[PDB]
Symmetry: C2
Subunit: 166 residues, 2 copies
């Protein structure tokens, strides 16, 4: 309903389908730089149930829910309310999700996810990071057959593991 007005504002070529570029330009990451294109790509492919390279209005109500939900999480854990998420808050956010990860390891996470290069993670980078972690966990989980947080794999199962990431 109110969602239709949003859709019409975002669908700038009035095609009836919201493309990557369109969704990108309707989202801010709180740093006055374009929203992470990879993040946009992931959100599109998530809800696009055709091979459309975009989302229609029905699919878009899903996207709108997804982004709003990700905003709740991000604002909850950015408690000094700066707009970025820091080492401590990232530790909190992933701890809230159920990850049990060492403090130093969050050094790597920040280095890997933060496009801004400022020791902190923006909203767009934050979504991708979490998405990438779900994926790595899904894969790991296929190989940790007795569920004790350990895997023994051969060279070939490793390669096919890394290749099933994609």
């Amino acid at each position: 309903s109110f969602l239709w007005n949003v859709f019409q504002r975002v669908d700038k070529d009035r095609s009836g389908v919201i493309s990557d570029t369109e969704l990108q330009q309707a989202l801010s990451n709180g740093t006055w730089t374009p929203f992470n294109p990879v993040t946009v790509r992931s959100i599109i492919s998530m809800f696009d149930r055709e091979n459309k390279a975009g989302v229609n209005f029905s699919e878009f109500t899903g996207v709108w829910k997804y982004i709003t939900d990700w905003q709740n999480v991000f604002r909850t854990y950015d408690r000094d309310n700066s707009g970025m998420i820091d080492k401590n808050e990232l530790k909190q956010a992933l701890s809230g999700f159920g990850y049990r990860l060492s403090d130093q390891f969050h050094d790597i996470l920040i280095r890997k996810f933060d496009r801004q290069g400022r020791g902190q993670i923006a909203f767009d980078d934050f979504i991708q990071g979490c998405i990438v972690l779900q994926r790595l966990t899904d894969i790991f989980r296929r190989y940790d057959t007795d569920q004790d947080g350990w895997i023994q794999v051969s060279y070939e199962q490793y390669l096919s593991m890394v290749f099933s990431i994609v």
Copy 2:
């Protein structure tokens, strides 16, 4: 020497530095489609000993050697001389490098490396594939401490392993 004439032909903006776009356009992959940009990016970052985003003439003599050498390998193993490399020939090429990999696993390799979508791997895709495999092997090797083609890793060492790929 003769290399200088090549460099001048490739350096189209006459800057004295060969950019990504420039190198790309001076290379064919034998399929009348642009040479894999990722492949170009890798070759650049390999020989660029500044943070230049390109190569000067000195560095370029390295690149020229690297590409010619990769051409020898590719032509050796594309023995039906089509321009593509197939499952059997890929099996040969990597076997020549010292990889001991199962026949079915080469299904995954072709699916993963072939941008053309035709069950075969082009010259540009072939270089990247091999490069990606060297990297995965280097990493694996750091973790296979007793050198028997097996690793046991925890969840956190796995994440940091996958993250050291990049």
